[PDB]
Coordinates of C-alpha atoms and ligand atoms in Angstrom, one line a residue:
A344 CA 5.3 18.9 -14.0
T345 CA 8.3 18.1 -11.9
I346 CA 7.6 15.2 -9.5
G347 CA 6.9 16.5 -6.0
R348 CA 7.5 14.5 -2.8
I349 CA 5.6 14.4 0.4
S350 CA 7.5 13.6 3.6
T351 CA 6.3 10.6 5.6
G352 CA 7.3 12.3 8.8
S353 CA 10.3 9.8 9.1
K354 CA 13.7 10.9 7.8
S355 CA 14.8 7.3 7.5
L356 CA 11.7 6.3 5.5
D357 CA 12.0 9.4 3.3
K358 CA 15.6 8.5 2.6
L359 CA 14.6 5.0 1.5
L360 CA 11.9 6.5 -0.7
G361 CA 14.2 9.0 -2.3
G362 CA 12.8 12.0 -0.4
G363 CA 9.2 11.0 0.3
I364 CA 6.2 9.6 -1.6
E365 CA 6.0 10.8 -5.2
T366 CA 3.3 12.7 -7.1
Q367 CA 2.6 11.1 -10.5
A368 CA 3.0 7.7 -8.8
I369 CA 1.1 5.1 -6.8
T370 CA 2.8 4.1 -3.6
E371 CA 1.4 0.8 -2.3
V372 CA 2.0 -0.1 1.3
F373 CA 1.5 -3.6 2.6
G374 CA 1.2 -4.8 6.2
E375 CA -0.6 -6.9 8.7
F376 CA -2.9 -5.4 11.3
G377 CA -0.9 -2.9 13.4
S378 CA 1.9 -2.6 10.9
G379 CA 1.6 1.2 10.6
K380 CA 0.2 1.5 7.1
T381 CA -2.9 3.4 8.2
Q382 CA -0.9 5.5 10.6
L383 CA 1.3 6.4 7.7
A384 CA -1.8 7.3 5.7
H385 CA -3.0 9.6 8.5
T386 CA 0.5 11.2 8.8
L387 CA 0.7 11.8 5.0
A388 CA -2.7 13.5 5.0
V389 CA -1.3 16.0 7.4
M390 CA 2.2 16.4 6.0
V391 CA 1.0 17.2 2.5
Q392 CA -0.8 20.3 3.8
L393 CA 2.5 21.8 4.8
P394 CA 4.8 24.0 2.6
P395 CA 7.7 22.3 0.8
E396 CA 10.3 23.6 3.3
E397 CA 8.3 21.6 5.9
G398 CA 7.9 18.5 3.6
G399 CA 4.5 19.1 2.1
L400 CA 3.0 20.4 -1.1
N401 CA 0.5 22.9 0.1
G402 CA -2.2 20.5 -0.9
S403 CA -5.6 19.1 -0.1
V404 CA -6.4 15.4 0.4
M405 CA -9.1 13.0 -0.8
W406 CA -9.5 9.9 1.2
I407 CA -11.4 6.7 0.2
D408 CA -12.1 4.4 3.2
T409 CA -13.1 0.8 2.6
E410 CA -13.2 -0.6 6.2
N411 CA -13.8 2.3 8.5
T412 CA -10.2 2.9 9.5
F413 CA -10.1 6.7 9.1
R414 CA -9.9 8.5 12.5
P415 CA -10.6 12.2 12.4
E416 CA -9.4 12.4 16.0
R417 CA -6.0 11.0 15.0
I418 CA -5.7 13.6 12.3
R419 CA -6.4 16.3 14.9
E420 CA -3.8 14.8 17.2
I421 CA -1.1 14.6 14.5
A422 CA -1.9 18.1 13.3
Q423 CA -1.7 19.6 16.9
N424 CA 1.5 17.9 17.8
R425 CA 3.0 19.2 14.6
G426 CA 2.0 22.8 15.5
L427 CA -0.9 22.9 13.0
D428 CA -4.5 23.8 13.4
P429 CA -6.5 20.5 13.8
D430 CA -9.7 22.0 12.4
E431 CA -8.1 23.5 9.3
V432 CA -6.2 20.2 8.6
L433 CA -9.5 18.2 8.8
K434 CA -11.4 20.6 6.6
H435 CA -8.9 19.9 3.7
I436 CA -9.4 16.1 3.8
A437 CA -12.4 15.2 1.6
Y438 CA -13.7 11.9 2.9
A439 CA -15.6 9.2 1.2
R440 CA -16.7 5.8 2.5
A441 CA -16.7 3.0 -0.2
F442 CA -19.4 0.4 0.6
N443 CA -18.3 -2.2 -2.0
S444 CA -15.8 -2.6 -4.9
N445 CA -18.0 -1.1 -7.5
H446 CA -18.7 1.9 -5.4
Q447 CA -14.9 2.2 -4.7
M448 CA -14.2 2.3 -8.4
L449 CA -17.0 4.8 -8.9
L450 CA -15.6 7.1 -6.2
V451 CA -12.2 7.2 -8.0
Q452 CA -14.0 8.2 -11.2
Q453 CA -16.0 10.8 -9.4
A454 CA -13.0 12.3 -7.6
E455 CA -11.8 13.9 -10.8
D456 CA -14.5 16.5 -10.5
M457 CA -13.1 17.8 -7.2
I458 CA -9.6 17.5 -8.5
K459 CA -10.5 19.7 -11.4
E460 CA -12.2 22.2 -9.1
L461 CA -9.2 22.6 -6.9
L462 CA -6.6 22.3 -9.6
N463 CA -5.7 26.0 -10.0
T464 CA -6.5 27.1 -6.5
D465 CA -4.4 27.7 -3.4
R466 CA -5.0 24.1 -2.2
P467 CA -4.9 21.7 -5.2
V468 CA -5.5 18.0 -4.4
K469 CA -2.0 16.6 -3.9
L470 CA -2.8 13.3 -2.1
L471 CA -5.4 10.6 -2.9
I472 CA -5.6 7.8 -0.4
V473 CA -7.3 4.5 -0.9
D474 CA -7.3 2.5 2.4
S475 CA -7.5 -0.2 1.4
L476 CA -7.1 -1.1 -2.2
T477 CA -8.3 -4.7 -2.0
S478 CA -10.5 -5.4 1.0
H479 CA -13.7 -5.2 -1.0
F480 CA -12.3 -7.1 -4.0
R481 CA -11.0 -9.9 -1.7
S482 CA -14.4 -10.1 0.1
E483 CA -16.5 -10.1 -3.1
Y484 CA -14.6 -12.2 -5.6
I485 CA -14.2 -15.6 -4.0
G486 CA -12.5 -18.6 -5.4
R487 CA -11.2 -19.3 -8.9
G488 CA -14.4 -18.7 -10.9
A489 CA -14.1 -15.1 -9.7
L490 CA -10.3 -14.4 -10.1
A491 CA -10.5 -13.3 -13.7
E492 CA -13.0 -10.6 -13.1
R493 CA -11.4 -9.6 -9.8
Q494 CA -8.0 -9.0 -11.6
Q495 CA -9.7 -7.2 -14.5
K496 CA -11.6 -4.8 -12.2
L497 CA -8.6 -4.2 -10.0
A498 CA -6.4 -3.5 -13.0
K499 CA -9.0 -1.0 -14.3
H500 CA -9.1 0.6 -10.8
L501 CA -5.3 1.0 -10.7
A502 CA -5.3 2.4 -14.2
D503 CA -7.9 5.0 -13.2
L504 CA -5.7 5.9 -10.2
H505 CA -2.5 6.2 -12.3
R506 CA -4.3 8.5 -14.7
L507 CA -5.4 10.9 -12.0
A508 CA -1.9 10.8 -10.5
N509 CA -0.2 11.5 -13.8
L510 CA -2.7 14.0 -15.3
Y511 CA -3.1 16.1 -12.2
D512 CA 0.2 15.7 -10.4
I513 CA -1.1 13.9 -7.4
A514 CA 0.6 11.3 -5.1
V515 CA -1.7 8.3 -4.8
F516 CA -1.2 6.3 -1.7
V517 CA -2.9 2.9 -1.2
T518 CA -2.8 0.2 1.4
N519 CA -2.9 -3.5 0.9
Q520 CA -2.2 -6.9 2.5
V521 CA -0.2 -9.8 1.2
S522 CA 5.3 -0.6 -11.9
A523 CA 2.5 -0.4 -11.7
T524 CA 3.1 0.7 -8.0
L525 CA 6.0 1.4 -5.7
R526 CA 5.7 -1.4 -3.2
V527 CA 6.7 -0.9 0.5
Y528 CA 6.2 -3.7 3.0
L529 CA 5.8 -2.9 6.7
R530 CA 6.5 -5.3 9.6
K531 CA 7.1 -5.2 13.3
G532 CA 10.6 -4.4 14.4
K533 CA 12.1 -4.6 17.9
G534 CA 10.7 -2.7 20.9
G535 CA 7.5 -1.4 19.2
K536 CA 9.4 0.1 16.3
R537 CA 8.3 -0.6 12.7
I538 CA 10.3 -1.6 9.7
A539 CA 9.6 -0.6 6.1
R540 CA 11.2 -2.6 3.2
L541 CA 11.2 -1.3 -0.3
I542 CA 11.0 -4.1 -2.9
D543 CA 11.3 -4.2 -6.7
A544 CA 11.6 -0.4 -7.2
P545 CA 12.8 0.1 -10.8
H546 CA 15.0 3.1 -9.9
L547 CA 15.5 3.1 -6.1
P548 CA 17.7 0.5 -4.4
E549 CA 15.9 -2.0 -2.1
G550 CA 16.5 -1.3 1.5
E551 CA 14.9 -0.9 4.9
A552 CA 14.0 2.0 7.2
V553 CA 13.1 1.7 10.9
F554 CA 10.6 4.2 12.2
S555 CA 8.4 4.9 15.2
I556 CA 4.7 5.7 15.7
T557 CA 4.2 8.7 18.0
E558 CA 1.7 11.5 18.8
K559 CA 3.1 13.1 15.7
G560 CA 2.2 10.0 13.7
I561 CA 5.2 8.6 11.9
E562 CA 8.7 9.7 12.6
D563 CA 12.2 8.2 13.2
Ligands
LIG1785 C1 -15.6 14.9 -6.8 O1 -15.6 14.7 -5.4 C2 -16.8 14.8 -4.9 O2 -17.7 15.2 -5.6 C3 -17.0 14.6 -3.4 N1 -18.1 15.5 -2.9 C4 -17.4 13.1 -3.1 C5 -16.3 12.2 -3.6 C6 -16.2 11.5 -4.8 N2 -15.1 10.8 -4.9 C7 -14.4 11.0 -3.7 C8 -13.2 10.5 -3.3 C9 -12.7 10.9 -2.1 C10 -13.4 11.8 -1.3 C11 -14.6 12.3 -1.7 C12 -15.1 11.9 -2.9

């Protein structure tokens, strides 16, 4: 399938990314607390539900939450400020809490069932979020005796995610803190604005985009 793109809500950020986040890819967004990475996650979970002319892919969402950062009220707000129905938007976000790293990996494995179910419907899964990719791994695998297994498990996890992205034409979006992935680093700019920097993209130039966080989520 042709690669599809989901608008981030920000024209600047979309430009940096070549149009938006890609299906058949993992986009990995790094940032410190308050950087905007989870806000971007929330915005994408709304945008993807729009038609292409509006920057979406008429898709459903699956959201794996490792540290209780998903806010249904923020989804409703973003939806409403974008002229959407907050109840319908929330209904098309399948939510799963991951309690630990094993469970997180299991949830990605299990997600394929729902992806298959929705695949040839009016609302196929088009966005799979893992927020965050590494919190459990960092918490559980401490020190050098643990690094080998941590890296192995994480590698397997990323491979499972790539497979779903490629096989089912889904944009995978994961958050992290400091191929395989398209890496974007968020930082604080001036006057409350945020800055995204794209690094080490094989086929997009490095660059920066300045964006805002508003009642619409992310936008210029
Ligand atoms: C196949 O999907 C399901 O059976 C969902 N009822 C539970 C689930 C599994 N993995 C997930 C990932 C994200 C959100 C929900 C889930």
